[PDB]
Design a protein around this ligand. Sequence first.
Ligand SMILES: Nc1ncnc2c1ncn2[C@H]1C[C@H](O)[C@@H](COP(=O)(O)OP(=O)(O)OP(=O)(O)O)O1
Ligand SMILES: Nc1ncnc2c1ncn2[C@H]1C[C@H](O)[C@@H](COP(=O)(O)OP(=O)(O)OP(=O)(O)O)O1
Ligand SMILES: [Mg+2]
Ligand SMILES: [Mg+2]
Lengths: 619, 611
Amino acid sequence: MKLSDLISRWIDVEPSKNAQIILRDRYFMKDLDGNYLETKWEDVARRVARVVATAELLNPSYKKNEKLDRIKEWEDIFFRVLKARLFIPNSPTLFNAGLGVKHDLLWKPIDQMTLEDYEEIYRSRNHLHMLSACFVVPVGDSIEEIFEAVKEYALITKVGGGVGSNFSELRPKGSFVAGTHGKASGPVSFMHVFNSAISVVKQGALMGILNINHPDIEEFIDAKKEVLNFFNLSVGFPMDKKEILKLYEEDGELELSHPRSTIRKKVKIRELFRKIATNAWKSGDPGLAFLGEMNKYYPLYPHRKINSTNPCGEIGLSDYEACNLGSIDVAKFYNNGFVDLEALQELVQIAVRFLDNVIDVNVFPIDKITKAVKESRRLGLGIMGFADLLYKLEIPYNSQEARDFAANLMAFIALHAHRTSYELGKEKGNFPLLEISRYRTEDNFVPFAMGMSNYDDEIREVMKMTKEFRRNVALLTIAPTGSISNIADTSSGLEPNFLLAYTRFVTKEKEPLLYVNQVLREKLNPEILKRIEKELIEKGSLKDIPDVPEKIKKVFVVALDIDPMDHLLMQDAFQRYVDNNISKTINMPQSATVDDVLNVYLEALRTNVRGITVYRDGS
Amino acid sequence: MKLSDLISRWIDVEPSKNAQIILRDRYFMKDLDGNYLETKWEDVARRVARVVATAELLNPSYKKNEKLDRIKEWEDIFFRVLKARLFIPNSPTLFNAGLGVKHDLLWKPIDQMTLEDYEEIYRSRNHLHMLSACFVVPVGDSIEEIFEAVKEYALITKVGGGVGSNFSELRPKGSFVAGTHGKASGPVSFMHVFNSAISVVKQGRGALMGILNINHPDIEEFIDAKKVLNFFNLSVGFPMDKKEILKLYEEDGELELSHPRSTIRKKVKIRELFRKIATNAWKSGDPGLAFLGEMNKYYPLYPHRKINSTNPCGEIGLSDYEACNLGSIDVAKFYNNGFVDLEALQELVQIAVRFLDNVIDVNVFPIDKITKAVKESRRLGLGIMGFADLLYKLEIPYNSQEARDFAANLMAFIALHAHRTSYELGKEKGNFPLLEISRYRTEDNFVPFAMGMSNYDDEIREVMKMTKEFRRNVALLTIAPTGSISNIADTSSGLEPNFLLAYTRLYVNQVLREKLNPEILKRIEKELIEKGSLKDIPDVPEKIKKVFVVALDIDPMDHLLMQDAFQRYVDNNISKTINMPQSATVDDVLNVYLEALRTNVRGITVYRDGS
Ligand SMILES: Nc1ncnc2c1ncn2[C@H]1C[C@H](O)[C@@H](COP(=O)(O)OP(=O)(O)OP(=O)(O)O)O1
Ligand SMILES: Nc1ncnc2c1ncn2[C@H]1C[C@H](O)[C@@H](COP(=O)(O)OP(=O)(O)OP(=O)(O)O)O1
Ligand SMILES: [Mg+2]
Ligand SMILES: [Mg+2]
């Protein structure tokens, strides 16, 4: 089926009372008086489509003759795709698109649009017109560079960004300093200033990484252990995953040392890992960031280096680069027991152009961010609605079937997204750094592991083509998507549903109202539903409810029906066809041990995953 | 008597065991291995005199083969003055002079010195060669300027400085921000970022001054802030005339709290605001009061430039990026048969002004903007220590009109020669860049202090007129707390009365040791330590009791009026603690504030005993 027929299927399906609360609440634009300029998702779609279409002004392939015709084609498709809720860019695009523009222009009927109207749009985008979620910022080993970094954190937070850094350059606590009477405070201690800044720069989340071999890593691992309340913390592995696993298997020892200090220590890697596991078992921090693995697949490595992730870990970014993200609701592509690949391919092509066009209309806070982002044009196209898509197809999440489906779906998306970047690199010019990148200076470079799909050969084929024409250094990610999947009424990201039923009280002049997963309602006797429904919200799962068919219980699994390894292996299935990283919570039961956590980390080291986040139920 | 003969009286008087502990501890330079390069106060004096002499390299008035001879003359005089402990520059000069210089050059016999040796000194001064105690740094109303200021705090603290800011530009908590989808956090919450920054940048920590204006919407939060901000001293700013605040208070009037970039306003009774300040100071000592308007009234460059903040101790009102450049004369060493030797004191004043002015030239500042603000105004902070001890010698009670009349003439005499010396140096060396736009130039009869308590007044107006033509420095005088350098000099601190006559910080007052009969001392020594004063000790003559008063024998108004006596002949500010008895009430504090508003004082610090 054609994307246009799928669009009609969906375009008039209105957001739920749920979604609408969130939209009114955070997304519908308001005038300076606090009054609504938007009162309907349709207004947001019009405004965002119009703004992103405007980047077509810069297309070197359009004669000025055509610009208005072709821009207005793009606003139309972008508009229809967004209103159908088939693809949603991420939150900042929806908040900040059109800020600075005359209000009479953002919602004008598209047939009343002049070229002058579009150029005026392009020119009146103010400094709040920031449309990326997150950035990476370096923090060098000097007072100057540390506090220049703190300033950049504050400046990025002001305009709504999240930020991450690797703090490993900072010389260990106690260390000699040539230019002071003080001993260096060390990374953990300075991170408090970073956390202070953010406690006072408000919006209406950070990533702090330290490397496994830093003299202060033990202090770091226990850092948030009663602050650093605004930090997520991860332990960085800049070396090969293979090498860490081998050291571990041998019960070996790691040398903790820093280039600009004489402080060193030897620790057993098993003991270090247990200390990480114990803390994660307790509080969920710190995660693991396999920076080596990210750099293994980084087209620009070692000209550029990936030292940190963004707060959610799903993009490894080099210094000053930005998260540029949006998501397709694959649950809307279910058609009679199959994924409509024809309609999905069109959307991929449109989505990659959409996200690539956000770069052109995006106002960044620092000049160095503009530069990093113009030079690589890294995109983050992902998916949401996959948990719900699986329910529809009657595939259990915790099954090899689901993982094979996942890898093929991802590989299909990868292929077309990367083909589209060829197309666009041809039509608009390549990303500035294509020449020094591995797509050029190398034979057979693929920016991910593959090896779980029949699309592999066609992908290597496209990767070869992109030696000549490539708009984007990387195209794919899987983000958490909490808010935009709520707007789209779908499951978040690649994550299983956390609950099938939960009670959400709508405050009035209070009065509880029940949600049951919509795909379940569609596939269970409302008969059976009415009785069990009460016990379901009590027990959180379908597992142990007596009179519910076997194969409703098998398919309608939630997060905690699914064991830690089944979580981890879904992550690996997607990671194999994603050129950035993956946001995946490895959920563990309350009854999980520290050893069970260790076993997840060991398996992580053998799979293709680029990071780990564990959350133990009840911790 | 001549300064040279006074020098010989003092030059071989060795620091006490006390002083020597402090010197070994913090002041004697050490090699990279932690070994001592200096073992005697003499080494410090040689090192510092040589480095400060080096600025003579830049004298436009010295020709050739006249240069080396005249530099060596200055090193020699600076040397002898420092070693006699007649004048000491403040701590940073003592710590950091000669950092970066070959060790074989700093302590070389002066007769072995070539011009090449001096030029080499001047050129190897490294980034730790920072010789100023404190700075003022602006904090504009944007995220960019806030955190750019935070960076500066950190950078200054790294090289040893303390820093003050007025945070009143920051828009009130809850206010509208265009560039953001959030509301302004307020100056009190942004101060936390600054404290946090300092908590982490360590020195061996930094003192800070945080000021918020009396009419800022957040002043009540501010007054109660440290009730953290543990690294801040806080004071309430009064940018308006003192007259106007005193009047509003007398009328039981109301103050508008407003901010140019917020719609948040409020009206408060000025009496209730003051009571809230007094209650907090009564408890904890903070916040002090900064009479910014009054400092600007006497600021030669107002309104081209404006004084918005003090340094952490409040004795220098500084405009943006300016630096404290301080040093003190031990006046107790100028006692000579019931009189102050004005002949020797006048010579030292001229030398001490030249010394402090030469510190500017060999100072390495952390930010370019500080270098600029300092080169342009050349503000100096010449002060005194040993004043309390000087009064003991002269047998003048601190808490007496006699003492305050003495203090004003002493201060006026010092101001006269210090300002004369700035004429002389403006002639010899060139004027401070901004002389032409300053009130010494663009005005008739501008005096940078109140005066009005001395026979020297006319001679001072006369010198102020001369300095329309030639002036090296925008201001020259300050009275600093001086705790460490008075310990080195074995003298009382600043203008403060002694806190105690006998103790452990030890430590029996030397002047008392000399007057009070031996044995009549030992029979009372025990009880002086216990009761803290001589007041209620049987059988110490009534006249030893009257002279040898300590801080808490002197009532709050007598403290305050001493402050006023000096402030009338000081062009910067005064560091004076208004000590109050434990039994003082919140109304007694309010009464101190009210009197402060009537006198010529530019700020207030109260400390109630036992709080
Ligand atoms: N005063 C201080 N207190 C705590 N840490 C400090 C202090 N000064 C510097 N540091 C830390 C911050 C960085 O981690 C590291 C580098 O400091 P930096 O500003 O580069 O000193 P420097 O560059 O003059 O000396 P060096 O030659 O040893 O790098 O030391
Ligand atoms: N997100 C924020 N949270 C808390 N305080 C903020 C935030 N953003 C700004 N502020 C404070 C810092 C300053 O006191 C004041 C000015 O912010 P600023 O960075 O100037 O915004 P702006 O300059 O883009 O907006 P404007 O045009 O109104 O000055 O508000
Ligand atoms: Mg450095
Ligand atoms: Mg601004």
